[PDB]
Design a protein around this nucleic acid. Structure first.
Ligand SMILES: O=C1Nc2ccc(Cl)cc2[C@@](C#CC2CC2)(C(F)(F)F)O1
Ligand SMILES: [Ca+2]
Ligand SMILES: [Ca+2]
Lengths: 543, 406
RNA sequence: GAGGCCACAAUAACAAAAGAAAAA
DNA sequence: GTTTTTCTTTTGTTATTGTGGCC
């Protein structure tokens, strides 16, 4: 009595015309009894020569080709619910709808495309042919069309019973109420009756499963949730595939186990290498593997969402470019946890990287809870403010407060806005070969000092940073430097604590040590005094 | 009756993914759409409809529904511009005060071509993916489609033809869901002529500031005036002028770079030679003179670029080819995202009146952070193109020098 | 007839995107 | 001279492998 959904083929396609191979006499004997039953129950129907299509028997029938030819649908349960967005309940019930697909009829005109053949054993006489009258197992459209039917069926019952939450997922209905167990059990059977009016069957009270419920790898209790325990095998030798399996398990745990870290097990997987290639663990990896093992020995659990309390997220810098966070409504009861990998750019600043962790968590929180959290951040309120008012990019974090849990995040240095009187003025520059990769970088000063160095297998820009490296190394604690590379001026005014290049990092430490630095830029090849002397010296070798 | 609309041959329908919404906006959107169903405007649709378009909830008092038809408008662009486009009145920018109010409800009573409704499909999401998502499609002309003005246009002139003979030195121009009406009247006389159309339009079922078009004046760059120059002060002025030469080729820096002879201390005071002081003053005169040699092309997209100039302040440029700015300006104040959204909206209004197109924006902001907060302050009924970029430091340093009005 | 599909992750690849910059 | 090659602070994609699941 369920009305069909009109379903069409992709524009300009015909149905599957795949040849059917022969089968075991034992296989042919088994299939004919399966189909003869399905035909009696009206799931399939015998067909004749009028039908030109066919699909091979394997799910009972392999619809790879029909699925390629079938229209697209709109996304169905695109993402999955996270347990931490479920609200607490006192009575839960799961009914698995049994004859799900068989209970929804297939669009009459579409049915001709689902034809299949049971061959005869001798294979000199043609076999028995059928087509589907109901949503076939493994047809691309069957899940979406069933869900459309199920949502329509559930509508009135939802209407007459607002306080009952029914979440639908695959063949299963998850039903939740704050009724007392007896009245809950009454409502469940009311639901079963309503569903049975449409031919959908579910387990009676004696056969319903008792909580906790396993679902999508979670373990759902009425008042808490958890994941099944995570065993990282202990092995002397690790292959590239082995490390893949660790990172995947570890990532899976990140949601409930606070402070998990993967970066240095990830760095091992960087080299392209056969899955069988044994890879020796670095010691940072040997270390952080251990720290993760201790984390997974503790028991953990998450609570559900209390729509009447504020959301709170707290983030801690867990190490080398890694971050970690926890989201709770009550001080020791976290809804979930998580991590952040970041490192989109080579030259990243912690302050910014934190802001990125905040933007990821803000988005995930809208998905799970429909609102944004409040933040606890290891960053002072004016260490934040000076950075962002001097940055070119706009941002916005609407509500956070300082939380004093080291390591704090702070700007390591800040460059001067005016020239330092009495500091030696250095003019810096470099130059390198377009083909031979030989380069030089050096400086001259208004006090008469000057120095050049030679570099190999480098580039113009790398040399230009070396030059600023020279001036800072060989100047006092107050210094003015003048360069022609906007490339090099930008990387330094980014204040990158972490950088891919080893050389960039060293400058950063040198800027900590100096306690006044004024860096300026002048355009190349304009004959500006100071720039012109050093351009001469450092372009000597090759120019 | 219905206009037979179609898409070009090599064009599928829209299939955009819906950005997550907050619980509050989902509740508001559910309410709004059931009332629009109950009135025959939208219809629930099935899973067999594969197309989609984003829906949001913006602030334009009590909550309002905004559909982001950007991708669909690109997909019917030959329809509403070639087939039924609207000419632009060069005169509109010249009135002394131009006001604009919402002609939204006007589209809600015309039927939409049946063989076309399927593309208007949109989806109300649900928190934590707990319910399948409410899918509708449109039975009438949707606010925010560009095909909607082109169709109600044949009917729009006939609504406005009595007022256009009566007051024939006032210009009327409609972009999307808005009527731009331009007048040279006094402020008391502008406010009476507006109630004249608000009463005139309630006679066809249509319910319902910017004294600026003569106030949009491109300010000059203003170079620093100093009684003593240091080697520093001249070094930085040289780099800025050198870059600004891409915009003004008359700019010269040779007499200034001559002044910087030998590796001087950055603080040392250089007196400007009489040659160098002439160059600096020739430059000053180039920058006070209106820029020349730039002319609007209609076969090309406008581009708008905005620089976070300083706390509470923003610089912008409307251009079609690099360095040939058809407009530049300064918006000053709230947070960054709130000001940017208000700056994006002001520039788009300005840009409509002047050319009847909206520009493609280059915004200095990470994309995800924009997607999160822009509807929090958006008020307009259209949504421009936009792209996420970084700002070259030379670009902000240069446009910092525009003279702010008083 | 060499399992599809979903979320998340890591790795590899194209970025011919875009932008800026150097150098010839 | 305009078209090359280098980097990156903006966006995106197809493929694999892995974790948790399903049909
Ligand atoms: O909102 C709640 N709260 C809740 C608490 C415990 C359980 Cl075990 C189940 C739920 C429930 C769900 C669900 C999907 C994950 C299947 C239900 F509706 F009850 F099914 O939804
Ligand atoms: Ca150089
Ligand atoms: Ca698996």
């Amino acid at each position: 009595p369920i009305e069909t959904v009109p379903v069409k083929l992709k524009p300009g396609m015909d149905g599957p015309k795949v040849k059917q191979w022969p089968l075991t006499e034992e296989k042919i004997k088994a299939l004919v009894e399966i189909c003869t039953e399905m035909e009696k129950e009206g799931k399939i129907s015998k067909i004749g020569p009028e039908n030109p299509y066919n699909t091979p028997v394997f799910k009972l029938v392999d619809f790879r080709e029909l699925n390629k030819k079938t229209q697209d649908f709109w996304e169905v349960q695109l993402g999955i619910p996270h347990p931490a967005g479920l609200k607490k309940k006192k009575s839960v019930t799961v009914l698995d709808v049994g004859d799900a697909y068989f209970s929804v009829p297939l669009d009459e005109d579409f049915r001709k495309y689902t034809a299949f053949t049971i061959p005869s054993i001798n294979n000199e006489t043609p076999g028995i042919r059928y087509q589907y009258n109901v949503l076939p197992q493994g047809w691309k459209g069957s899940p979406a069309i069933f869900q459309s039917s199920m949502t329509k069926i559930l509508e009135p019952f939802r209407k007459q019973n607002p306080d009952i939450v029914i979440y639908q997922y695959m063949d299963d209905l998850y039903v939740g109420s704050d009724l007392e167990i007896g009245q809950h059990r009454t409502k469940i059977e009311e639901l079963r009756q309503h569903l049975l009016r449409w031919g959908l069957t579910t387990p009676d009270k004696k056969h319903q499963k008792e909580p906790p419920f396993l679902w999508m790898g979670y373990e759902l209790h009425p008042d808490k949730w958890t994941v099944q325990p995570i065993v990282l095998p202990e092995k002397d030798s690790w292959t590239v595939n082995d490390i893949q399996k660790l990172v995947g398990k570890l990532n899976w745990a990140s949601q409930i186990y606070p402070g998990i870290k993967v970066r240095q097990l990830c760095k091992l997987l960087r080299g392209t290498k056969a899955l069988t290639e044994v890879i020796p663990l670095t010691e940072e990896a040997e270390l952080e593997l251990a720290e993760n093992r201790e984390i997974l020995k503790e028991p953990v659990h998450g609570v559900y969402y209390d729509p009447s309390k504020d959301l709170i997220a707290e983030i801690q810098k867990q190490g080398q470019g890694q971050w970690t966070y926890q989201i709770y409504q009550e001080p020791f009861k976290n809804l979930k946890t998580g991590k952040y990998a970041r490192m989109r750019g080579a030259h990243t600043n912690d302050v910014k990287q934190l802001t990125e962790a905040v933007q990821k968590i803000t988005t995930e929180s809208i998905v799970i809870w429909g609102k944004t959290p409040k933040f606890k951040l290891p960053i002072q309120k004016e260490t934040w403010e000076t950075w962002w008012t001097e940055y070119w990019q706009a941002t916005w974090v609407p509500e956070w407060e300082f939380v004093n849990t080291p390591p704090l995040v702070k700007l390591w240095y800040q460059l001067e806005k005016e020239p330092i009187v009495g500091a030696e003025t250095f003019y810096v520059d470099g130059a390198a070969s377009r083909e031979t990769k030989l380069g030089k970088a050096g400086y001259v000063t208004n006090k008469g000092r000057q120095k050049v160095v030679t570099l190999t297998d480098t580039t113009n820009q790398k040399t230009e940073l070396q030059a600023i490296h020279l001036a800072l190394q060989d100047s006092g604690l107050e210094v003015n430097i003048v360069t022609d590379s906007q490339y090099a001026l930008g990387i330094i005014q980014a204040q990158p604590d972490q950088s891919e290049s080893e050389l960039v990092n060293q400058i950063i430490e040198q800027l900590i040590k100096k306690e006044k630095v004024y860096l300026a830029w002048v355009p190349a090849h304009k004959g500006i005094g100071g720039n012109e002397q050093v351009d001469k010296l450092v372009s000597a070798g090759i120019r | 009756e219905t206009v037979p609309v179609k898409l070009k041959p090599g064009m599928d329908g829209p299939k955009v993914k819906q950005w997550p919404l907050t619980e509050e906006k989902i509740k508001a959107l559910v309410e709004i759409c059931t009332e629009m169903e109950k009135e025959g405007k939208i219809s629930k649709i099935g899973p067999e409809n594969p197309y989609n378009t984003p829906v949001f909830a913006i602030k334009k008092t009590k909550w309002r529904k905004l559909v982001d038809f950007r991708e669909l408008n690109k997909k019917t662009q030959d329809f509403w511009e070639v087939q039924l486009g609207i000419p632009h009145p060069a005169g509109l920018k010249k009135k002394k005060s131009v006001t604009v109010l919402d002609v939204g409800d006007a589209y809600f009573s015309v039927p939409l071509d049946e063989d076309f409704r399927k593309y208007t499909a949109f989806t109300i999401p649900s928190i934590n993916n707990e319910t399948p998502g409410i899918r509708y499609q449109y039975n009438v002309l949707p606010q925010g489609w560009k095909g909607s003005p082109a169709i109600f246009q044949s009917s729009m002139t006939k609504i406005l033809e009595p007022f256009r003979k009566q007051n024939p030195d006032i210009v009327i121009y409609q972009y999307m869901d808005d009527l731009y009406v331009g007048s040279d009247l006094e402020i008391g006389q502008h406010r009476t002529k507006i109630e004249e159309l608000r009463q005139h339009l309630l006679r066809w079922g249509l319910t319902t500031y910017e004294l600026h078009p003569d106030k949009w004046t491109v300010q000059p760059i203003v170079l620093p005036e100093k009684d003593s120059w240091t080697v520093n002060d001249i070094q930085k002025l040289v780099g800025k002028l050198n870059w600004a030469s891409q915009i003004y080729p008359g700019i010269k820096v040779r007499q200034l770079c001559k002044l910087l002879r030998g590796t001087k201390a950055l603080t040392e005071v250089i007196p400007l030679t009489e040659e160098a002081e002439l160059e600096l003053a020739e430059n000053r005169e180039i920058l006070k003179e209106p820029v020349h040699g730039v002319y609007y092309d209609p076969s090309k997209d406008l581009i708008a670029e905005i620089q976070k100039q300083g706390q509470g302040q923003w610089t912008y440029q409307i251009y079609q080819e690099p360095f040939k700015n058809l407009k530049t300006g300064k918006y000053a104040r709230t947070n960054d995202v709130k000001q940017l959204t208000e700056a994006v909206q002001k520039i788009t209004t300005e840009s409509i009146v002047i050319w009847g197109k909206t520009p493609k924006f280059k915004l200095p902001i990470q994309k995800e952070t924009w997607e999160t907060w822009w509807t929090e302050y958006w008020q307009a009924t259209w949504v421009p193109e936009w792209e996420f970029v970084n700002t070259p430091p030379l670009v902000k340093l240069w446009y910092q020098l525009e003279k702010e009005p008083i």
